[PDB]
Amino acid sequence: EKQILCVGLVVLDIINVVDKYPEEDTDRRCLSQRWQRGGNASNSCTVLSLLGARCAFMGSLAPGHVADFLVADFRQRGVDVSQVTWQSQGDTPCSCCIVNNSNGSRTIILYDTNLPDVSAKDFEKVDLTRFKWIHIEGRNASEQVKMLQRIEEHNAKQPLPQKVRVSVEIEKPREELFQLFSYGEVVFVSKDVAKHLGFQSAVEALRGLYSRVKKGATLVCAWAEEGADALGPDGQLLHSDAFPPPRVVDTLGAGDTFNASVIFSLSKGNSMQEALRFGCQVAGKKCGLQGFDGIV
Amino acid sequence: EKQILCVGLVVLDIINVVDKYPEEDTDRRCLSQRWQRGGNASNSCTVLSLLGARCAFMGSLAPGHVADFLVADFRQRGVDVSQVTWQSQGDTPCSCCIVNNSNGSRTIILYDTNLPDVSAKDFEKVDLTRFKWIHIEGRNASEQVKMLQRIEEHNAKQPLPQKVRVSVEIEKPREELFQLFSYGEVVFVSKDVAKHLGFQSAVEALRGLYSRVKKGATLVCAWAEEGADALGPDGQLLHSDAFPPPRVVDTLGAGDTFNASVIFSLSKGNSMQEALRFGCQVAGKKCGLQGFDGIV
Numbered sequence: 001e002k003q004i005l006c007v008g009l010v011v012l013d014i015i016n017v018v019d020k021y022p023e024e025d026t027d028r029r030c031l032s033q034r035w036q037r038g039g040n041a042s043n044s045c046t047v048l049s050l051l052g053a054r055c056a057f058m059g060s061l062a063p064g065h066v067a068d069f070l071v072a073d074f075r076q077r078g079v080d081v082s083q084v085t086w087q088s089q090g091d092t093p094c095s096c097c098i099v100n101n102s103n104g105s106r107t108i109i110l111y112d113t114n115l116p117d118v119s120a121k122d123f124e125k126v127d128l129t130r131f132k133w134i135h136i137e138g139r140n141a142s143e144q145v146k147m148l149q150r151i152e153e154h155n156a157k158q159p160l161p162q163k164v165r166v167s168v169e170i171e172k173p174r175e176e177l178f179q180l181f182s183y184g185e186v187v188f189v190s191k192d193v194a195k196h197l198g199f200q201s202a203v204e205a206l207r208g209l210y211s212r213v214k215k216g217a218t219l220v221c222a223w224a225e226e227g228a229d230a231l232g233p234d235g236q237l238l239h240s241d242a243f244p245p246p247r248v249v250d251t252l253g254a255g256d257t258f259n260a261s262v263i264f265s266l267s268k269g270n271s272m273q274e275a276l277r278f279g280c281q282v283a284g285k286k287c288g289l290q291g292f293d294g295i296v
Numbered sequence: 297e298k299q300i301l302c303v304g305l306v307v308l309d310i311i312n313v314v315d316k317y318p319e320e321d322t323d324r325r326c327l328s329q330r331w332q333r334g335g336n337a338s339n340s341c342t343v344l345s346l347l348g349a350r351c352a353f354m355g356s357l358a359p360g361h362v363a364d365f366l367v368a369d370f371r372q373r374g375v376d377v378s379q380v381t382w383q384s385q386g387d388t389p390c391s392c393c394i395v396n397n398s399n400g401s402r403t404i405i406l407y408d409t410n411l412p413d414v415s416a417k418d419f420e421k422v423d424l425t426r427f428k429w430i431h432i433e434g435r436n437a438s439e440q441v442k443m444l445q446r447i448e449e450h451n452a453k454q455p456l457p458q459k460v461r462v463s464v465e466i467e468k469p470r471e472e473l474f475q476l477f478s479y480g481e482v483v484f485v486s487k488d489v490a491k492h493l494g495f496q497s498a499v500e501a502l503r504g505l506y507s508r509v510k511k512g513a514t515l516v517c518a519w520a521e522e523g524a525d526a527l528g529p530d531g532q533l534l535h536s537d538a539f540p541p542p543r544v545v546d547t548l549g550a551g552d553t554f555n556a557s558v559i560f561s562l563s564k565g566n567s568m569q570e571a572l573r574f575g576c577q578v579a580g581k582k583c584g585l586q587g588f589d590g591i592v
């Protein structure tokens with residue numbers, strides 16, 4: 001019963017739900033406030049655990065009351081925390097999020113600049129035989145490239161059912177990340193990255209970025225209310241319409257819900273078309289709920 | 297030596313300093329993030345301690361890691377916490393603040409609705425002989441009115457140097473707070489309260505609200521970059537121009553810096569004109585600094 005490893009960020013999300021987006025220099029009372037475990041790779045673990053998958057998290061944490069709460073939340077959700085890279089120096093990332101109840105918008109201000117990242121040296125200790133899928137949240141690209149090369153070396157010595165499946169996510173429009181396109185069987189590219197590169201649709205983004213992926217890889221792009229699209233080695237464009245809820249209340253973590261649902265579906269042997277549909281269905285349902293718990 | 301008691305709110309302020317105000321549904325990294333002890337009465341204690349006054353705080357806290365940090369901060373600053381009302385049930389207030397460093401603006405989203413307030417019964421335990429000044433942050437007006445009546449009864453039996461000096465702040469435009477104008481020798485009314493009552497200037501606000509204050513009392517109204525004004529029993533309008541810093545970087549806690557500095561100056565025997573000037577000088581300096589620490 002092999003696990004799914006998600007390598008990336010874990011952050012304390014201090015979420016304020018408001019009735020209207022605040023105007024600069026004003027004071028208001030929130031409708032509600034919650035302290036939620038966040039970060040793209042950590043949120044993928046939450047969704048994977050809710051779907052019934054055995055999953056592990058690999059990311060950095062600094063000792064303190066914040067890390068204890070985040071670890072206690074991971075444990076309660078049954079996410080394995082043995083690969084956590086404990087840092088003697090630095091600060092656990094923390095974000096302040098504004099969730100607008102009226103349209104489901106999420107405005108994030110993140111503090112994640114004072115913590116050493118998972119190194120290639122740290123990743124060298126990971127027993128790759130306990131994982132069937134490794135998802136890397138694109139962050140410190142130069143070190144993560146070495147982590148991806150290690151999996152490639154491992155998989156070349158393994159028979160087809162013993163090969164670890166690899167997915168990569170390019171979510172932030174940072175130049176350094178673009179070297180990660182070349183790795184993984186599944187590459188997730190955000191609407192934000194695509195729009196920053198000049199793309200006005202998911203189909204445009206897939207055609208424009210496919211030459212960057214590994215030979216035989218599938219490029220995946222979710223475009224919010226326009227749905228989600230994919231392009232694999234057969235050159236066929238795949239699409240699923242979005243499944244918006246009756247009332248969009250919380251879009252915070254919707255992207256991760258999509259990524260984790262696609263990984264879940266693909267790891268179970270479903271096709272890319274089935275994974276695209278499932279991804280839109282689960283993230284769609286998530287957009288009509290506060291947090292993640294109501295998806296199942 | 298007698299202390300200055302500030303009765304009111306203590307909040308966990310989570311401050312994100314940004315280079316520009318975030319647009320709804322965007323993601324940004326902060327320039328810096330800090331976990332600062334807030335609340336209006338709580339902030340006045342910080343400024344009073346920095347100025348050299350022996351001050352105490354009276355407010356509610358719920359047990360947890362947040363309260364421990366807030367208490368540890370108060371203690372480190374030499375603010376007496378013996379009058380803190382520990383609540384068995386509820387949550388310590390927490391706000392998420394966006395400080396824009398290009399203009400000094402502060403946007404606050406506060407969670408403070410799940411904690412019992414300091415009662416008149418809790419205030420009955422306060423030894424009024426240990427305090428020369430009691431400042432009340434207007435909140436639960438009906439209970440605070442009984443606290444104010446207790447001080448009045450006490451002072452009537454005391455010789456002039458043994459009477460406790462009383463100030464009240466009316467910061468929030470809540471109807472309930474308007475009964476507090478009738479109490480205290482010094483009444484602080486915010487620009488926000490005045491603008492909500494229809495007043496377009498501090499002078500207009502003072503002439504329109506003076507009939508509400510106690511006989512012999514002084515009404516004080518700070519009007520941000522327009523300075524601060526006052527009106528006492530002699531019917532003379534007093535004014536101090538604002539002292540803006542070279543660069544306005546943080547206005548969070550500016551009003552509390554003004555209030556605490558006026559209290560400090562008045563408790564030392566300075567005139568209202570000298571207190572108004574000092575209040576604008578200290579709050580003005582504070583605005584060019586992140587936090588409070590750089591005022592002295």
Ligand SMILES: CS(=O)(=O)c1cccc2[nH]c3c(c12)CCCc1ccc(CN2CC[C@](O)(c4ccccc4)C2)cc1-3
Pocket residue numbers: 103104105106222223224225226227228242243244245248251254255258279280281283284287320321
């Ligand atoms: C895999 S997926 O399910 O395709 C998906 C993945 C990641 C993110 C996603 N967002 C949304 C979806 C989605 C799909 C359906 C739900 C939905 C409804 C409405 C809006 C649009 N709203 C939400 C704030 C909004 O973007 C806004 C912007 C600026 C100001 C105010 C609101 C205007 C988006 C989504």
Ligand SMILES: CS(=O)(=O)c1cccc2[nH]c3c(c12)CCCc1ccc(CN2CC[C@](O)(c4ccccc4)C2)cc1-3
Pocket residue numbers: 024025399400401402518519520521522523524538539540541544547550551554575576577579580583
């Ligand atoms: C006792 S006191 O010192 O008089 C004082 C007491 C309480 C509050 C106070 N605010 C300000 C002062 C002040 C006075 C000096 C510093 C200052 C400079 C500039 C502005 C005006 N700026 C600050 C963001 C601003 O209010 C804004 C609004 C909306 C969008 C962008 C910026 C437009 C205010 C103050």
